[PDB]
Amino acid sequence: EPLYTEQDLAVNGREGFPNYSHPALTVTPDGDLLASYDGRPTGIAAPGPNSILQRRSTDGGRTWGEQQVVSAGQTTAPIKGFSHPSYLVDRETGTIFNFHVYSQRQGWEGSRPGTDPADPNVLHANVATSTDGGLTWSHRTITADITPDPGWRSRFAASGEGIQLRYGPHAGRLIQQYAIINAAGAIQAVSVYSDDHGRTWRAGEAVGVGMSHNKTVELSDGRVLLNSADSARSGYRKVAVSTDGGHSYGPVTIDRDLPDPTNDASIIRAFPDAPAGSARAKVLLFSNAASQTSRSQGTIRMSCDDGQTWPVSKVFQPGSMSYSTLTALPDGTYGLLYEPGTGIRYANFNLAWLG
Template structure:
């Protein structure tokens, strides 16, 4: 949980900002004050000192009903876990034009802390997951080995889930299911997980994690083929893993994109995220070792459609500083 940075909070917790692009579908019956289709607007949905001293690590998704959910850390300081951090959320039912009041997904008394949210929507059931790490005594680099779900020295793997579009939440701990006891620290990579749309593993839910094994760090996929009833992890890829994201390619493979300096590293899976090829540098994607994001532009189109091959990628495109926020289309 160290060295954490995000695209939307590069100003060290000053605000969590959201960009909202108007669309004809979202604004076909546009009330007064809504942006015109194609207009890019921005707003702060969480500001340091209002409700919490600091906010960091935003995640964003759209539910099956079209509701936007933005989850992020509410932090007493800018420090990572272990700290008395809480995971909070805001909802928008009008495409991001207005946002409902901030709600708490998970917060408990010190020294407990919960942080680095990653959202994942099961588009077959409508269930929304938000994965995060749970600490008492230690964060990623101090966590003990083992997967005892009651051990305060083990950084735990928790998630909350909602079956009513993010209005109410229940929670679950899956450390014993997904953490190899030989691993030390393990945390969900913040941002958004994926669900495979086609092929042999259609319907599979995949959430990325970073793990520490010995002195090295790796990336690994946690996956579920039964809508989250049970979870497993595949084979770690690395060393050199950190915050990482996956995206489903039009040919059915899963591509993993990993935080690394001076360039992002990538790996590929042909078995739905269970095993990956070794990391390779992508020299078209300079990176200062910061979080990033990758997604399909049109995830629902058929595999033969030209836009099935379009990918969107965002990061701070430099090799030595968290600056030059850049969005790319492949």
């Protein structure tokens, strides 16, 4: 019964880019898998004129089509880069979003306050929207929409995959996590969300200190669990929980069950369509580097109690393992798009493999 397959989707130096990074994975409403990541073209510019790329599988992840460009970096001055994709599917409308950085002159650290897309010293937040299953895209810079405090100096959508709430008064809400640098220079986490199917986006209340890229997941009772890397380097993930559909979070604490070397992770519902409060609705899967000292020992953990306990875990990548993102596939198995050091690798496993 156990299933664990893997195949590279992007290898550094092949298919036009010296480096590929920052995986995003999703399943379209029609059932295709989309894998996205950024390509850093040959060059020494930083932030570089990266592109957001995509590959599609129409056979459940077995084979993958040609690498396509979602957002094309501009390699001539004025330089423009697009990186760190996150997919978000509105399963009610069928629309697919791909959030990503839009860089010009400044990266994360160098960005300064401002929301004018024409300002090249701002690290901008973009989102691409597709109503045709990811074939074609329209683009928006949404920095102004998601910067309620002009003191916020910088932001990026955490690469990976966002969510749509299924439960409660905000059912249908689309939620994409961001990390920001606030006025005081702290790194905080904040949910960016839409209650109108992606027509408009806003930021919620930022939370925490020493945060980083972070992810959210809807628990069995509709609470939204936020799970962040810790830029203060505790050796663990940081967690907080929202009771208002991701708008605001309670206190942030380190989660001793989730060792982490300060690196990306993903956390998903194993049964995203399970009804509220059901046993299956309590099941979470988590992927990250379990090593506290390096980006290695990629591990999947499972919780059957809304993330309170993680009684099952298994290493999927003993070696180098940086960013990773999980998605639930229609066939009941799980896709895992991750960085083995050589680019972007796609794995598919089932719960039987987890044991």
